[PDB]
Structures are given as C-alpha cells and as structure tokens.
Amino acid sequence: PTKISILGRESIIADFGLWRNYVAKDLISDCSSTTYVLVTDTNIGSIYTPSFEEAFRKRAAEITPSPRLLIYNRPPGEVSKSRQTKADIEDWMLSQNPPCGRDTVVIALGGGVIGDLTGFVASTYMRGVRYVQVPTTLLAMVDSSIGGKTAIDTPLGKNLIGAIWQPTKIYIDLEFLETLPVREFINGMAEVIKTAAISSEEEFTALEENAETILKAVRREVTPGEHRFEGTEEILKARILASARHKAYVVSAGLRNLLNWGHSIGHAIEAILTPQILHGECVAIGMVKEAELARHLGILKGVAVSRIVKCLAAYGLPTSLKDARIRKLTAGKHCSVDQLMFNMALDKKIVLLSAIGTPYETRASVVANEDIRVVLA
Ligand SMILES: NC(=O)c1ccc[n+]([C@@H]2O[C@H](COP(=O)([O-])OP(=O)(O)OC[C@H]3O[C@@H](n4cnc5c(N)ncnc54)[C@H](O)[C@@H]3O)[C@@H](O)[C@H]2O)c1
Ligand SMILES: [Zn+2]
C-alpha cells in the first residue's frame, strides 16, 4: 500500500482495491470510534456502499462493543454543496440513536462536491470531529481531497463559506476510476497535466507517451467482471500519484500559487460557461491561454505551447473557446473579452511558465491588462 505524507503525517494511502479490502479494517484500528458516518451521493453509493457495509460488519464483528456505520445519501450534483444540505446532514447525525458525538469519524465517499461538503460538516460538528477522504473522481484524488480546504457554495459564489480541516486519512483507490464517467475522467486530467507542466518535464513527457494507452482504457468496453485498467495499473497509478504527490508536497511546504497555473483565465472562463462546461475543461483552455500569454511576453518558447496544446488534446480536453463541443453545449453563451476581463478583476497576477516543468518565478507574475487582452483576442 503506497503511502504519501502531507503536513508531517502519512495520511495518504493509495492503491487498487483499498475500498474492497483495506479501508474498513484500517478505520477500525487506526480511527477507532463507536460511530462511523458515511456521506456520499446516490450515483456513487449505489455502486460502492454495499460492499463496504459488509466489509465494515466483518471488521467490526471482532471489536466489542461493535461500532456502527451510518449512511447518508445526498442527491448528486453541486446543488448539494449548500447550507441546507450541510444543515440536513447535521440534523440527521443529531437524530441518531444515540446522536453522533465527538468521537464520530465521518467518511467522505465521493468527488469534490461530497468531499468539500463532508469535510466542512466534520469541521463544525460539535466544533470538530475526525473525518477521512475517499476520493472517487480523478480531480478529487489529485486535487480537492488534498489540502483540507472544505466549504459549500452560496448564490453569490463558490466555496465562500467553509474551513480548513485536515482529514485523518486520504484513501486513494484507483478502482473508483473504473466507473467514473469518461467526461469526468478527462476533466480531472486537466489538473494532472497542470501539475506536470509546473514541476516536471520528465513527468509531462510520461503523460504525452501514456495518453493513447490511458484514454483507450477509459473509453474501453469492460466485461461484467474484469477491471477497466487491467494491464496498465502501474502506468495509471504512476501518473495519478505523481500529481497527488506534488499537491501534497506543495501543501506541506507562494509556491502554491503555481498550483493556480491556467486558473486565472480558466476561472474567468468558467464563471461564464458553467455549469455547461466543466472546471477542468475551462482550465485546459486557460492553460493554453496562459501559455500563449507567456509566449507573448517572450518568456515561453512556442515549441512549449504546442506541447501543452497537444497534450491537453491527447487526453480529450478542449484547447480553445472555439471548440466544437464547447460551442454546442454553450448555445447562447459567449465569452467576450470584456466579460473575461471583468471576471479576472474579481480574482493581475498570472502564473507564467518559462519551460515545461519550469516556472518563470516561484510565484505568480504581474501582467499588464494590455497583454492579457491580446491573448484573449
Ligand atoms: N477542496 C478544493 O480545494 C477543491 C479544488 C478543486 C475543485 N473543488 C470542488 O470540486 C467540485 C467538483 O468535483 P468533481 O469534479 O469531483 O465532481 P463531482 O463531485 O460533482 O462528481 C462528478 C460526477 O461523477 C459522479 N461520480 C463521482 N465519482 C464516481 C465514480 N467513481 N463512479 C461513478 N460515478 C462517480 C458523481 O455522482 C457526479 O455526478 C466543485 O464543487 C469544486 O468547487 C474543490
Ligand atoms: Zn482546478
């Protein structure tokens, strides 16, 4: 079982099959409690909750008095990352027999929506209770589940109310990616490529070379019982864990600014195109625009911009606002240069790359609005 440290503790545990034969046992022995609360959505729970209920019972059977496992299922979608849902979960926890107390260990089984929501619930339940992250999406495995950043959204913005609350454990089971929708897997690759581009030209090269194999496995038709990533586990785990390790490294150390490469323009685009277009899709276009911005300022070589554009496309991500899929889903929406500048103002410090794997500076750089408007043209 591969382990990765974060903030001094060895909380990240990664491998294929953890959910089926490692987590329940580990929670009972390492996160001892009388009460375990599992929060997930109906899409994810319908697939993974049954096996775990059994793994838990078997693991708890030995302990005495045996602990309980309580399950809360939220509707899928970001609509659930709200004040009302947080309050409903808390009320439900307080309605148990007996009510969930300070020893409760909350299990966040899901993507960034469930992870953000669940972590925030854990942070304030009776002023704070332990929780673990069990990321089921690619973006969650390498980004959202690491760092302790929790929150909910309000009608005025994303993640505006929340808290920094570190999970006791982060179980990364790559088998969850076997059922993750193709579009979501691709969406998550935006963060993986971003991380390689700002830290390792060698890792970026590995991604370029593994693109066809991985995407093939993702788009593959699986037989009722076989594993989707059959003979490419080592490759997948390597590429995914490289991004999670970087995120962990950054969180454990201005350097975190680099993690926002592609997000200055990316977030501006998303503010306009969401919810039709996903975060990673917006950031992919953002990485291309920000790479072109650096080239405009003569900081990044054109050859480098081409590699970024092709690597993003090789994983199925859009590289321009003129992308066919984007326009089809955004019928009626348009990202005017002014609308994009307006959004970037509410964020100008953009992360600039001098070479793949090499940032211009160990932080975001200042850019004149004049130059930004030219790359958005
Ligand atoms: N905490 C942070 O620092 C941070 C960083 C980045 C993004 N985010 C947050 O992440 C959220 C987006 O999360 P996301 O992209 O993971 O999407 P998501 O959590 O909305 O999940 C996407 C969809 O996939 C389904 N799904 C998830 N895992 C599955 C699996 N293994 N098999 C089958 N279906 C599965 C879900 O039911 C859902 O419908 C946003 O709300 C954003 O604000 C937070
Ligand atoms: Zn992002």
Notable traits:
15 helices, 49% helix, seven-stranded mixed β-sheet, 377 residues, Dehydroquinate synthase-like, alpha domain, binds zinc ion, alpha/beta, binds nicotinamide-adenine-dinucleotide, Rossmann fold, globular, 13 strands, two-stranded antiparallel ribbon
Describe this structure in words.
- The PDB classes it as lyase.
- Keywords: dhqs, open form, form J, domain movement, cyclase, lyase.
- The assembly is monomeric.
- The entry is titled "Crystal structure of Aspergillus nidulans 3-dehydroquinate synthase (AnDHQS) in complex with Zn2+ and NAD+, at 1.7D".
- The protein: Pentafunctional AROM polypeptide.
- The chain is α/β, with parallel strands linked by helices and about 375 residues long.
- It has 2 domains: about 180 residues, Rossmann fold (3-Layer(aba) Sandwich), CATH 3.40.50.1970; about 200 residues, Dehydroquinate synthase-like - alpha domain (Dehydroquinate synthase-like, alpha domain, Up-down Bundle).
- About 50% of the residues lie in helices and about 20% in strands.
- The strands form 4 sheets. It has a 7-stranded mixed β-sheet with strand order 1-2-9-6-5-3-4, with helices on both faces.
- α5 links the parallel β5 and β6.
- It is globular and about 65 Å long.
- Zinc ion binds next to α11.
